[PDB]
Design a protein around this ligand. Structure first.
Ligand SMILES: CCCCCCCCCCCCO[C@@H]1O[C@H](CO)[C@@H](O[C@H]2O[C@H](CO)[C@@H](O)[C@H](O)[C@H]2O)[C@H](O)[C@H]1O
Ligand SMILES: CN(C)c1ccc(O)c2c1C[C@H]1C[C@H]3[C@H](N(C)C)C(O)=C(C(N)=O)C(=O)[C@@]3(O)C(O)=C1C2=O
Lengths: 156, 1033, 48
């Protein structure tokens, strides 16, 4: 952990675009992580700061960094309904089928929160409709347990 | 009246003696305290939910209690915090003047009826309802110096053997333990548990069964069969008493007949109820007692009694145990009392010395001297009658009134002496004529002074309570002063004064007095010559007056305002804040660095450092700590460099270097409560369904915009805590149901192991104490540990937690705030230098009006007590000024002449302003009260000048100028006498340093500056005022 | 109910009594704990 790495973790989370910009110009570690293994990209994805996601990725951030429980920024973006961030991540090589420690995928999380547009995008980029989490569930299982009829149809 | 008592000196003595006995009795029985009660009454509700996160606390405890705080009288507002240490505090603040006991019982009764709606474990811990104080009389530290006791050992010893006797000590109102009594600690081992197919559920069940009180009954109980010989109680199971008994608690009998005991799956020890705080005193384990003063109690007597009680405990201390006093207001308060008594006494001396310089005979100097102790004594009696205490405010109220209270008997005596020397009349006849000249004026003056000071008693809230202390003290002294001067001094004048031959002005005397008298006789002619020339040219002086008035306004606008001077109270604070999520051990390293700094670099100043890891002011948790620094006695810290402001500045500078931690030192507020001076206290409120995240975004939007106005706003910041990573664990209901694992077993297994769980009570050496189960530390540290905890399914199989759960990181709040029952975020800040708090609050409302839909706001605390208690000042000053004018118009029987007196006001004020500005002081309460007393006396000086001038015009047909010159000639000496005594008597406060000199400087310099210009300017300007006003009308 | 005098003194009477500090005008306090499990604590106040 570095001085500027910490500042970047904070600025990325806070969505302070200009501070991120200046930090990028000063060489702040884009691969810094906190105790739970979240990188600046994890944070920007979680909190939905689109422009910082993009700046970070232009600046060599690991698009497929995972935290200490196996979760990637695409997991976060998909789970919290950040549609454009999800597109940018996948466009930059994010693993559409990344499994966290629970065998949970971005499709699972998006389906669970009923983010229909994000589900379609993930399917577009080749998300595995049949992947099962540790309990043997799929996105489809989630949709009918949730009683989400629209989503159930998409997953067919 | 003065007539009545001129012929009744014995009656006059009797009244004086009664007044002195009353005062003597009052001084014996009067409560002593640093400050009186000033903050509005507040009740705090505190609750604990072991192992609960902030959201859980809020949504199962805080909201439920808040929804029940209805039908309580005089509530101003309500606020709360819910945090991830499992703690909630709800604070309800009531209107000033509300009966604090009724407030508390109404709160506690509404709570009582909400208790059945709270979680069981919260009902178990109990919910405390208490009166909120922020001041301690003292803090007694208890340490162990031979390394044989942990803080838990010490805390338990204090609870068992010290607390109760202190709580019973005379004068102490409340005692708080810094730590807890022992709890029986069962530290579970998941590996051993699984080995025997046991879970924390079986542990809890076994403890409840084998540690319990069981009702039995009686042998030969009624109704008996007749002929029964014996009646005896049956005693059955009673609570366990020892760690050994707990270790032997039976959990299981295996098939080989072997036995599983609790000590086979757990480590068992006496320990603390909580482990969030680590307290150290110069690096050694510590506990302590925080002690508060009982109502109406004497702080100095209580501290002495506390120390006596402790000494009689000393013999029974285990080895290494030592008492220590890191905080004790009593020595500081001792210094204050003595200093003011010193000031009052040398004031009495100075009146003697001054009156003797001018009057030059013992009897004449004795008469004004005697009046002073009589007036002071009477004032204490009146204070006692009004139920006031001897405190910092009332004591300084008296020295602020010295000039006024001392002046009456000086004026009476000086005038009788002047009459004798000018007319030759005998003492008695002279005293009659003299009183005829001044009695009505002195009584009118009394009315005018009442009009000046009484309205100050009628401000609301906290500042009203502060001003009231001065107002009643000053009006009393002023009142007693006139009474004594109209009753006792004339009796003494008529009976004790040696006659003076007509024309005898002492100019024929030898040595010093002869020279002084001739010098002062010629100076008076010089003086009247000047006034003569001045009155030939009043135009320029009306100009010079406007210049003074303009200058006054200029200096006033630019004098920065505060409340009460900081002091070197012999202690101060150091804040330690590490980044969010920092551990208790990390914070301890910083605190150690801090403590080590003070004990080496400030070894000549610092007595001790009391490090409290885990405690913050605006949020607790493992990443916050406090270092409370106690300094050596003021006598050992010569010079400004070794006083708290310096020490603090040095410390804050040194700790700038420290890496991942914000560490800074600061002096304590005068009155632990109130304002940050130019500070405000703002609540952002969720008025709709918005939720914590949207409220946070709105807060960040408000903060960014505030930051864009450095010109108006400065240091606007959240008071609370930022969201942090937390570990979300989802139990899979289907998989639990398929494995035959119940959700209750799952959830008490998780909570009991990881959060700890209060099972029941046991008896430790005659005292009832708690029993807690919880995982030994090494099995509840990390996510991989979760899978080491097994739950027993219905069919006997042990199922690892990992089989039916899944986890992920997320963010959440470690401290949720609410305000008047709605989700909130408190924001602190202050007016930029040069700007008013009113201005800064106006902007905040403007910025707040541009926030997202559903986001509202409110003002609380110091700010609430301004948007309400600051609309008052204008109307109170107006009443004062109107009543003053009306009293004067009555005195002078004239609608215009009162103006010639009221014009004096700026003359004292300019001098006070110049002094405070030059010395770099502020416009504080002491400055302001001093302004009033300075104004009061100069008004009085003018009132007598004008009275004399007008009397000469009215009754001796003398001309305007002739009357004015004669008046001013006669008023010169008495005016110089009071001004000399008061200015000298106030000089020590001006220059003093160390203990309490902050307040002494604050009253001293304003008064000395105001008196100099008031006396120097008024003896030239009121002649002008009177002449110009008369001509105009 | 069912508790002896000692038990009830330790778990009830002393608990209440150690909280009976800092009450205005208190002159004295007296209590008993008996074999019925019953406890009475009486606080007597200054005459006015
Ligand atoms: C203390 C200050 C008093 O200072 C006083 O000033 C006035 C002027 O206003 C002087 O008065 C002198 O100058 C003024 C202006 O030429 C004349 O109107 C006046 O007749 C003359 O004697 C006094 O001689 C002096 O003593
Ligand atoms: C905040 N303060 C003055 C201090 C200073 C030094 C200390 O050593 C301590 C405190 C707070 C007290 C509060 C007490 C409390 N109670 C009176 C038993 C309490 O409810 C808790 C708690 N976390 O719930 C404590 O931490 C606590 O046990 C504790 O350990 C403290 C403690 O050790």
């Amino acid at each position: 952990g570095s001085d500027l790495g910490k500042k970047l973790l904070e600025a990325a989370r806070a969505g302070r675009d200009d501070e991120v910009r200046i930090l990028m110009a000063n060489g702040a570690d884009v691969n810094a992580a906190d105790v739970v293994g979240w990188t600046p990209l994890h944070l920007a994805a979680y909190w939905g700061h689109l422009e910082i996601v993009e700046v970070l990725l232009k600046n060599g951030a690991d698009v497929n960094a995972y935290d200490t429980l196996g979760s990637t920024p695409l997991h976060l973006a998909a789970h919290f309904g950040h549609l454009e961030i999800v597109e940018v991540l996948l466009k930059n090589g994010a693993d559409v089928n990344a499994k966290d420690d629970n065998g949970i995928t971005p499709l699972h999380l998006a389906a669970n929160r009923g983010h229909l547009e994000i589900v379609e995008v993930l399917l577009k980029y080749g998300a595995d409709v049949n992947a099962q989490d540790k309990f043997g569930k799929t996105a489809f299982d989630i949709s009918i347990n949730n009683g989400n009829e629209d989503l159930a149809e998409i997953l067919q | 009246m003065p007539n009545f008592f001129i012929d009744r000196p014995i009656f006059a003595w009797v009244i004086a003696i009664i007044i002195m006995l009353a005062g003597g009795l009052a001084i014996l029985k009067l409560p002593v305290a640093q400050y009186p009660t000033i903050a509005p009454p507040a009740v705090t509700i505190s609750a604990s939910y072991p192992g609960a996160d902030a959201k859980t606390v809020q949504d199962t405890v805080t909201q439920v209690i808040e929804q029940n705080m209805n039908g309580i009288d005089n509530l101003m507002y309500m606020s709360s915090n819910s945090d991830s240490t499992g703690t909630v505090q709800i604070t309800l603040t009531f209107e000033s003047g509300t009966d604090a006991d009724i407030a508390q019982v109404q709160v506690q009764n509404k709570l009582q009826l909400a208790m059945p709606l709270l979680p069981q474990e919260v009902q178990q811990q109990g919910v405390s309802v208490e009166k909120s104080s922020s001041s301690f009389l003292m803090v007694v530290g208890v340490i162990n110096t031979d390394g044989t006791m942990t803080q838990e050992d010490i805390s338990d010893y204090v609870a068992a053997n010290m607390k109760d006797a202190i709580s019973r000590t005379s004068g102490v109102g409340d005692v708080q333990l810094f730590g807890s009594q022992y709890a029986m600690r069962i530290w579970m081992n998941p590996n051993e548990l699984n080995k025997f197919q046991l879970t924390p559920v079986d542990v809890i069940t076994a403890i409840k069964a084998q540690n319990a009180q069981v009702a039995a009954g009686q042998l030969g109980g009624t109704p008996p069969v007749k002929g029964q010989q014996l009646n005896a109680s049956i005693i059955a199971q009673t609570r366990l008493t020892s760690t050994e008994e707990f270790g032997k608690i039976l959990l299981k009998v295996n098939q080989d007949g072997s036995r599983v005991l609790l000590r086979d799956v757990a480590k068992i020890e006496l320990g603390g109820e909580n482990y969030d705080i680590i307290a150290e005193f110069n690096g050694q384990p510590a506990s302590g007692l925080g002690i508060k003063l009982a109502t109406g109690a004497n702080a100095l007597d209580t501290a002495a009694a506390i120390r006596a009680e402790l000494a009689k405990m000393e013999p029974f201390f285990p080895s290494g145990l030592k008492i220590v006093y890191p905080y004790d207001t009593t020595p500081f308060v001792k210094i204050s009392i003595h200093e003011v008594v010193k000031t009052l006494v040398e004031a009495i001396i100075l009146v003697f010395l001054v009156m003797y310089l001018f009057l030059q005979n013992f009897r004449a100097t004795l008469i004004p001297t005697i009046a002073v102790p009589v007036v002071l004594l009477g004032t204490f009696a009146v204070l006692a009658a009004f139920g006031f205490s001897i405190n910092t405010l009332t004591m300084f109220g008296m020295v602020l009134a010295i000039g006024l209270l001392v002046d009456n008997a000086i004026v009476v005596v000086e005038n009788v002496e002047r009459v004798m020397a000018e007319e030759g009349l005998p003492p008695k006849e002279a005293t009659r004529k003299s009183m005829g000249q001044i009695q009505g004026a002195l009584v009118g003056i009394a009315m005018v002074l009442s009009a000046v000071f009484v309205p100050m008693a009628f401000f609301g809230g906290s500042t009203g309570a502060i001003y009231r202390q001065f107002s009643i003290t000053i009006v009393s002294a002023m009142a007693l002063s006139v009474l004594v001067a109209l009753i006792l001094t004339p009796a003494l004048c008529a009976t004790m004064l040696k006659p003076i031959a007509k024309g005898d002005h002492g100019e024929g005397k030898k040595g010093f007095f002869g020279w002084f008298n001739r010098m002062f006789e010629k100076s008076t002619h010089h003086y009247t010559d000047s006034v003569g020339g001045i009155l030939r040219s009043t135009g320029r002086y009306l100009v010079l007056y406007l210049i003074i008035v303009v200058g006054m306004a200029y200096l006033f606008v630019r004098l920065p305002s505060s409340f009460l001077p900081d002091e070197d109270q012999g202690v101060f604070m150091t804040m330690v804040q590490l980044p969010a999520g920092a551990t208790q051990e990390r914070t301890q390293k910083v605190l150690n660095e801090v403590t080590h700094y003070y004990l080496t670099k400030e070894k000549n100043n610092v007595e001790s450092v009391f490090a409290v890891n885990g405690f913050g002011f605006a949020g607790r948790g493992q990443n916050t700590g406090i270092a409370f620094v106690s300094l050596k006695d003021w006598a050992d810290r010569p010079g400004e460099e070794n006083k708290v402001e310096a020490i603090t500045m040095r410390a804050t500078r040194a700790f700038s270097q420290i890496k991942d931690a914000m560490v800074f030192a600061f002096n304590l507020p005068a009155i632990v409560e109130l304002g940050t001076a130019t500070g405000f206290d703002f609540e952002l409120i969720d008025q709709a369904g918005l939720g914590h995240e949207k409220l946070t975004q709105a807060r960040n939007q408000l903060l960014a915009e505030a930051a864009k106005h450095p010109d108006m706003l400065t240091s606007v910041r959240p008071n609370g805590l930022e969201d942090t990573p937390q570990f979300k664990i989802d139990i899979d209901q289907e998989k639990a149901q398929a494995l035959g694992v119940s959700i209750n077993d799952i959830n008490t297994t998780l909570g009991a192991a990881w959060g700890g769980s209060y099972v029941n009570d046991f008896i430790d050496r005659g005292r009832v104490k708690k029993v807690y189960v919880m995982s030994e530390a090494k099995y509840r540290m990390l996510p991989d540990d979760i899978g080491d905890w097994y739950v027993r399914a219905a069919d006997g199989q042990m199922v690892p937690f990992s089989a039916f759960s899944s986890s992920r990181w997320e963010y959440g709040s470690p401290r949720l705030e609410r305000y008047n029952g709605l989700p909130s975020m408190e924001i602190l800040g202050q007016a930029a230098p040069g700007k008013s708090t009113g201005e800064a609050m106006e902007l905040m409302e403007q910025l707040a009006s541009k926030l997202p839909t559903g986001v509202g706001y409110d003002w609380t605390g110091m700010s609430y007590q301004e948007r309400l208690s600051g609309n008052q000042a204008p109307s109170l000053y107006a009443i004062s000024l109107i009543v003053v004018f009306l009293c004067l118009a009555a005195l002078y029987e004239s609608w215009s002449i009162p103006f010639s007196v009221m014009l004096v006001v700026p003359l004292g004020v300019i001098g006070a302003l110049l002094a405070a500005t030059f010395r770099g002081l502020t416009n504080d309460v002491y400055f302001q009260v001093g302004l009033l007393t300075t104004i009061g006396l100069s008004a009085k000086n003018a009132i007598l000048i004008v009275e004399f001038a007008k009397d000469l015009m009215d009754k001796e047909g003398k001309g305007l100028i002739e009357a004015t010159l004669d008046a001013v000639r006669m008023r010169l000496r008495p005016i110089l006498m009071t001004s000399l005594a008061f200015i000298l008597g106030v000089m020590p406060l001006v220059i003093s340093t160390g203990a309490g000199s902050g307040a002494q400087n604050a009253v001293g310099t304003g008064v000395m500056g105001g008196m100099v210009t008031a006396t120097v300017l008024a003896i030239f300007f009121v002649p002008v005022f009177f002449v110009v006003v008369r001509r105009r009308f």
